[PDB]
Symmetry: C3
């Protein structure tokens, strides 16, 4: 009736989602996406990393050559998987600093072994035991050589092996601790004496200690395992009068991205970049709360089990019912755009989406999605994070380092999502406000702001006229005389 109404508005949905911003602990938005990965398939995917399933073998048993581990000879891995069911089935042994030898072999990622011809003239080689059976016969660790007397003589060993290669050699060797004096004499022909293994740059001396230990596979003796790395140009010197469990050669030691993980998860024929002890997990999300132990391109571990990133504007119910604009009011019936126009004129009541504002909001949200989704970084060999034995100081430090790290990342995650969500609310609010301001400016003196996100346009404004406003081609001069007469009439 000589005027029209033009309202600016934004969509709303019936099923919104609650997120956290800096301004609000809980604010409902039109949509959100989860940034914490909280589930796994439960299987370790055999691709794209080279998996070695230890089965009944620990890495150290596979290294020494426990008979059940013969199948592992010379294999490589990106990730060696050690099973809780694993058990030793050879001569009872220990490794002082077991954790370090495990770690250095794990990180090297290879069991490649090269035999060498040591001169063991004057002694008997290849000692075996019923505690270490291979194909039902008494045997021993494959990579070790139990030397004993020859004709009740054990002449002092003073044996050399030069490293004339261009790579390092890793030697694994041991000392036999007999149960009794009787065993000492029966095995080596004389009283126990120390073993010294040296190079130009290092030395280790180990004393065999006679005594009963609790029987394991009916063996009260023990073997203690040691290692030596020999550089190119250096020489291994082995010096012993008995009790030597000698090396048969060396392991290659390599550097790269290999590691070891304790897990009982089955190995699957599938492809996944991120491995945890619970199974492989997708790495689309920036964070995860599945396990602090990871290998590969993995989301960062956080304490939160959910963090929702807003991917839409504030969700505002439509006030119940004159058309009305965005002031405390969303439009559930606007389904082809995020922002738009509703009008009332001579020809009826209509709605149209505004593409520009809708696309600007969507583009920006997609931009932050692109920064946060599918952008994980790889980590490989790290520190251990679960422990089967009590140890004190070093373990306290390992645990505190990891606890510290997780709390700092959990804090970063919490802040990041609150900041991002505040920014999303601000940028989506801003597109609405800019649309309203642009429209106000077009209309000049031909309309007044009704306070509800709508303009009273003080002239006849048919469908084409409204279209000209929406398209940005409205010429205010054309209508100004009509509008001014209508606005500043005296009633």
């Amino acid at each position: 009736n000589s005027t029209a109404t033009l309202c600016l508005g934004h969509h709303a949905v019936p099923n919104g989602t609650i997120v956290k911003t800096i301004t609000n602990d809980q604010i409902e938005v039109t949509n959100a996406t989860e940034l914490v990965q909280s589930s796994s398939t439960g299987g370790i995917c055999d691709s794209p990393h080279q998996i070695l399933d230890g089965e009944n073998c620990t890495l150290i048993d596979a290294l020494l050559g426990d008979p059940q581990c013969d199948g592992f000879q010379n294999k490589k891995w990106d990730l060696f998987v050690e099973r809780s069911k694993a058990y030793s089935n050879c001569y009872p042994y220990d490794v002082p600093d077991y954790a370090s030898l495990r770690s250095l072999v794990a990180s090297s990622g290879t069991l490649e072994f090269n035999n060498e011809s040591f001169n063991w003239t004057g002694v008997t080689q290849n000692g075996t035991s019923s505690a270490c059976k291979r194909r039902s016969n008494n045997s021993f660790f494959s990579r070790l050589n139990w030397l004993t007397h020859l004709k009740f003589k054990y002449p002092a060993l003073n044996v050399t092996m030069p490293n004339n290669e261009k790579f390092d050699k890793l030697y694994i060797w041991g000392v036999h601790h007999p149960g009794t004096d009787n065993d000492q004499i029966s095995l080596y022909a004389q009283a126990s004496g120390r073993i010294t293994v040296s190079t130009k740059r290092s030395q280790q001396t180990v004393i065999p200690n006679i005594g009963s230990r609790p029987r394991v596979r009916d063996i009260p003796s023990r073997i203690s395992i040691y290692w030596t790395i020999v550089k190119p140009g250096d020489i291994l010197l082995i010096n012993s009068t008995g009790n030597l469990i000698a090396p048969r050669g060396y392991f290659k030691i390599r550097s790269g991205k290999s590691s070891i993980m304790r897990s009982d998860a089955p190995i699957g024929k599938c492809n996944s970049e991120c491995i945890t002890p619970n199974g492989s997990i997708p790495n689309d999300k920036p964070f995860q709360n599945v396990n602090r132990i990871t290998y590969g391109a993995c989301p960062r571990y956080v304490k939160q089990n959910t963090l929702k990133l807003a991917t839409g504007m504030r969700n505002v119910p439509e006030k119940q019912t004159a058309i009305a604009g965005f002031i405390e009011n969303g439009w559930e019936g606007m389904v082809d755009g995020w922002y738009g126009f509703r009008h009332q004129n001579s020809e009826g009541i209509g709605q149209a989406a505004d593409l520009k504002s809708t696309q600007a909001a969507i583009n920006q949200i997609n931009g932050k999605l692109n920064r946060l989704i599918g952008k994980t970084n790889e980590k490989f060999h790290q520190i251990e994070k679960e422990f089967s034995e009590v140890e004190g100081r070093i373990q306290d430090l390992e645990k505190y380092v990891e606890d510290t790290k997780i709390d700092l990342w959990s804090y970063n995650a919490e802040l990041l999502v609150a900041l991002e969500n505040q920014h999303t609310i601000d940028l989506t609010d801003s597109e609405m406000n800019k649309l309203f301001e642009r429209t106000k400016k077009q209309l000049r003196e031909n309309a007044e702001d009704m306070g509800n996100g709508c303009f009273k346009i003080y002239h006849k404004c048919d469908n084409a006229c409204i279209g000209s406003i929406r398209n940005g081609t409205y010429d205010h001069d054309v209508y100004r005389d009509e509008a001014l007469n209508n606005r500043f009439q005296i009633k």
Copy 2:
């Protein structure tokens, strides 16, 4: 005189406080609150954590059973407090890896001890010394058993103790290092020989070393202390020909939240969640600069001694004196609200608070207070952070881990408070701006913006009229003819 003035404004206070934002290193606000706890009472509150005051006893002395520590037998703790005055008063001893045994016992949180009947047939038990008096008589550590020859014989000990319990057993034992060959023979009847303590899964051999050490309580000998954990189903085997300081049984070893702290603070009858070596501290604040060593639900340690969180808007002096609005001007006389209205009309000059805007600002500030205040998290046994001896590598790492952690938290604290304060300034500024905009919209063509946060209303607007604007019931149509004539008159 045919018009009225309506000004929008906000309060101001005579005693504002300076805070930091992202925009300003120093900006005065109406009020702030401190987020760094910087004082302690100076006492350790005995509630709600179970405190054990070591008095003259270290934990290790209480474990071994130094006579002055007999009162500690079998006690438990959440926090064992070790005093600087503590001193040993029994046989001179050392503990290789003292720090680890201290740590593992501290974390276990119990001195529960179960006696066992070891078969020491063939030797004399219960050796004592004048260096370790109990009730004025020569004595020894309560939990240890100094075995010596019987009739100048010391038959080889080969003694067993199975763990048929469903929990782990912690055994503490030792080796006696005699001052001279004469002592060796007088005590054990033969030359010194090694001690081996083993289980199915582990072994330790220790060599007694004869020699003079500086006398302590007139004793040139030493005892060295060792420990062994025996799992259920396993067996302790002790094998010795002399110099054995034997266990009398085992300690329970538990897991939980127990720890140990070095402090000289007195223990008080009071209740506080957070304990530091300086005393308990309140844990209302998110940060603290009292001590990096903490136990319980504690604020996080930061380097800053103060961080002030704004709890009010910018504080702006009232310009000296026509009423005027918020543009570069606060209202010290507005004491019943944070924002409001001042008017001049036919009936005088008045002021009224706006509840809605005031409450919206207060609610939001209370929200951020609720997130930051009284929300501390608990930590228990951690790593040591002060050291009485120089050690090198491990200590360097312990110190660097803690330094690293504190710098990262101090950074987080600094950023958090700057961000929060910027947000507080922004949300309080926003309530002022929204109040002004809402008012502008009500007034439509009946008023003009005077540029100083006030409107010139171009009609007679009595107290009820002004009230209708403040209440949001003003009907612009009622006054529009009058206002338009007044606005667009030609003078």
Copy 3:
């Protein structure tokens, strides 16, 4: 022609720089500055820290007194620089826990040595070797004393040295491991026996181990090095029957800010606070990607090789050509200010800078520069971050601690710069918007907003009139009758 145009605008430059904000991965601004230091001179500046260039000597060789290191006696340092070319040229030795002794001496920062008169009655002193020549003669480590038999007797040593000083004493000593039984007898007159060095609070026993090691400088024997710290009031007791490499006195041990660094960078005559192995670097910037190893007041190490901080507003091309304001349009021709006014009136078309808005933007940007530039903090002795040997557990932890730290700082840097740049864009946009709003308010009913950042002023407004608007002295009442007639005329 009875009207004027007044446009508000901001500068633009032909050569802008791309930065990252929270809103945009790439946004062009007028200027930026680099926050990551990525180059070094390549030399270590000898000022202001006290540098000690080890040349051919490691710290440990300088400590023991290898002949080529005699020049180092008693010197101090802030930073000891160890060269890759360094080599030992004396008796072949090792140090169990070499890394710790290196670290504790490095951190102490002094080689100050005080000779003491030990009573070595009954033995020969000052043993020497061809493996350790000094001025072409057979010699030995300067700070050690190789004792051997006197007249084929080596009476048991039981020797004391009290610490009656008020500072700690650091004693360095050793054990000689002879190649053969023949050497043992030729040197010490009897079979090898253990060495015990003790105090009231500590003890160490070391066993000499006879055996061939690979010859070095024709020596198949080895010396193993040990250390003891003796507190004031305590006593050093040395107890040996042979194989003792005795101390000649003690080192002072101090506490302070000293460290050690591995580098081949030459030492220069220059002054720089921050030292890295690549050379000294400037410390103006808050971050650096030169080296994770640093000493002194240094930028923090990050993974990024560049982080650009915006130091100007968004850079917006001038739309091609009616004068026009800031809406999607910057002014390349405005060179004497950041914001300003362009006008068209009766007297022509002019431009003027607005000082207030320009200065407010510049001041704020300078403020954030002042917070970020030249504000680095000092760190001194830390942990090692590069390793020449494989070690396992401890090294894994050292590496993980540093990796963890760097990732957290790299994250903080990335967020900080994105946040700061967003704030810079917001504050510079805000000065433009405030200038426009201030102008709008002055003009009252005398102008209309043309939508392009300009006002149509509906009255004759000559150069003085425009000046009154720019100066904030424009009196709208003077022109209102003229303007209203022009605005609300009917055409």
